[PDB]
From a paper:
This response works using a so-called “partner-switching” mechanism, whereby HK activity—and subsequent phosphorylation of a downstream PhyR regulator —controls the activity of a transcriptional inhibitor known as NepR. Stress activates an HWE/HisKA2 HK, phosphorylating the PhyR and promoting sequestration of NepR away from σEcfG, allowing transcription of stress-responsive genes to occur. In the structures of both RT-PhyR and RT-PhyR′, we observed a typical arrangement between the SL and REC domains.
The propensity for the unphosphorylated PhyR homologs to bind RT-NepR′ may be related to the density for the typically flexible α4 helix seen in the RT-PhyR structure. Alignment of the RT-PhyR SL domain with PhyR structures from other organisms reveals a shift in this region where its α4 helix is situated between the expected NepR-bound and unbound positions. At the short timepoint, we observed transfer only to RT-PhyR, suggesting that it is the cognate partner of RT-HK. For RT-PhyR, we saw many peaks shift into positions distinct from those seen when the protein was titrated with either substance alone, indicating a synergistic effect. In RT-PhyR, these two pathways from the unphosphorylated conformation evidently act synergistically to promote formation of the final phosphorylated RT-NepR′-bound complex, as previously proposed for Caulobacter crescentus.
Residue numbers in the entry:
A (entry chain A): 10 to 77, 85 to 264
B (entry chain B): 10 to 265
C (entry chain C): 10 to 74, 86 to 265
């Protein structure tokens, strides 16, 4: 049933729009506007592609149209990016669309998609080095994330395996970015650890890395702006880190 | 990466030059004259300072000099604010705008103006003094986000100006300007009914003549390209109170 | 009508062949030879591909049938590498399009394109005067030239200023826009500079490249089209540098 197929894909649309905007409120609003457009003008929903691709195609139309807070530092960083490059990269990595599917969604051809992705990775080489804190109780995961962070040119403030170790580490050195698992070693939650750090140290971008990200993509309650799945591919971690970094 | 860094900063050099001149025309001409001076004399660029600071340091040398921009048209102040040139202390408006709207620290403003941090602080103190010598005007606020509109009103009132009212739609804005002519307009782009604050401003400008307009918007970079008609005065969202105060005083100099 | 479709692609074949040879006279002759071949031997022309693709395919077939120190370096370049690069960058052909044109596989096209991009790192830094009247464009061209490893002798924005700057430092390569700030022409500036300091390779930057590809009057050997991609400016400056000295 197409109603049920669209409903199943809405969480991922929220994931994508939240990553583009850095915000749950903006991302969830763009995802909702996409569904509204499809209900108001059903002819917008291409039936010759998969519902997932058709849904994201409509979202990219709304995304391109002027319309619908953000730090002025983030606004300056984002303003220097080549248009449509971050969209093509995120669609290709975190959303795992093939290059032809990406060309469909952005109403382009596959060779321009390849250029946009290549331009995305070029501008990622000019980015400044930041400091990243990792909240993760599985030591092999933490070590793997450290390797990815380092090869991106970033520094690690440290690894925290419990909420309390995380609140303590953030007090020693305010990170530029937090990578956060949910269930920690002492059965405390990375969600609480993050909330406590942010109350104390101000807004810092946070990427939650979790199995079943769908449970944080409902739109019904406060939820993260950046979500990577477990298991993860390295390309998805690099895209999320570079994306969240724009929001300092 | 100096070339890339200088080009990234050119939009902000336009913002600054436009505020000082009162016109997109002369401001864009002054910012492009700054870049043309660096390409002509690369040694003009200080590598010992950030590209942003070095760019603005070159701009201030040109601004202060007896010379004028060799541009496609005519460069200059704005005629309206010529009468205030006799009452204002040199380098005070420059120091205030650089340290507020342009977000330079007083040490970076000292470098830019080839001065010391203490002279810059006194220049900023003398700018705020001469702001008390300014007469009260009437400000119209076009803005649909009510909390921002309220906040803007508290700043305007705290500076001693009156507020004609707040309009949240293009239709409310054309009515408001007809009820009471404003000396200055603060305008957002996307209004409550999705109508356009640019369109609203143009309509007011037709009926009442030239009134200084300050556009308040996120991503001001999209109005700082010099590739199309664009505002002379731009405040960012989010803003700091000191930036709103520096933009309201600056634009008031160009009022009737 | 396939005759008109072929005619409309001739200017771009002249661009390609001129850049490969470094000379208007040779590039225009190679482009005409390609049309002549198709008229003489209609079998050469494949109707299953786009008329632009089929025309470049016939030219590559024909393509395969100065200064000793400059020839000594150009001889170290791997065969078919410059062609695959220029076809993919300035000619905006897709990898599969280039593979058809060279009667190769898209696999080999990337092997070639990579080898060419790697052999560009073995290039010598060179002086590059930029005659652009739009400062924003000049800054961006200075970025690509500097990243490639070349110096910038200067940036001029008027005919008289470019002629003056040529007197201070003889460039090895001139990037020249057609219409300058004082309504002067970069063509006249380039001609006056070359008349004085001798022959120097020139890459003309221009919106409207087709009106410089007629073959009916003296025209540039190398042309970058506004707007441009960095890969295009990089393929045009590497190609043109082969003819510097
Ligand atoms: Mg865990
Ligand atoms: Mg608004
Ligand atoms: Mg021009
Ligand atoms: Na669709
Ligand atoms: Na982008
Ligand atoms: Na997300
Ligand atoms: Na020639």
């Amino acid at each position: 049933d197409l109603s049920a197929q669209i409903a199943a894909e809405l969480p991922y649309l929220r994931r994508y729009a939240r990553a583009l905007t850095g915000s749950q409120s903006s991302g969830d609003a763009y995802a909702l506007a996409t569904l509204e457009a499809i209900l108001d003008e059903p002819a917008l929903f291409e039936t010759g592609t998969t519902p997932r691709v058709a849904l994201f195609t409509v979202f990219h139309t709304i995304w391109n149209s002027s319309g619908s807070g953000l730090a002025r530092a983030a606004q300056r960083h984002l303003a220097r990016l080549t248009p449509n490059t971050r969209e093509a990269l995120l669609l290709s990595t975190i959303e795992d669309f093939t290059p032809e599917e990406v060309a469909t969604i952005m109403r382009s051809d596959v060779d321009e998609v390849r250029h946009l992705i290549n331009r995305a990775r070029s501008e990622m080489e000019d980015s400044v080095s930041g400091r990243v804190m990792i909240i993760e109780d599985e030591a092999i995961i933490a070590l793997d994330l450290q390797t990815i962070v380092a090869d991106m040119g970033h520094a690690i403030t440290g690894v925290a395996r419990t909420r309390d170790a995380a609140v303590a580490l953030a007090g020693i050195e305010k990170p530029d970015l937090i990578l956060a698992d949910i269930q920690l070693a002492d059965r405390s939650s990375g969600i609480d650890a993050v909330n406590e750090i942010l109350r104390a140290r101000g807004d810092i971008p946070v990427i939650f890395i979790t199995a079943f990200p769908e449970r944080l993509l409902t739109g019904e309650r406060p939820e993260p702006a950046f979500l990577i799945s477990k298991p993860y591919r390295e390309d998805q971690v690099r895209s999320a880190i570079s994306q969240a970094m724009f929001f300092a």
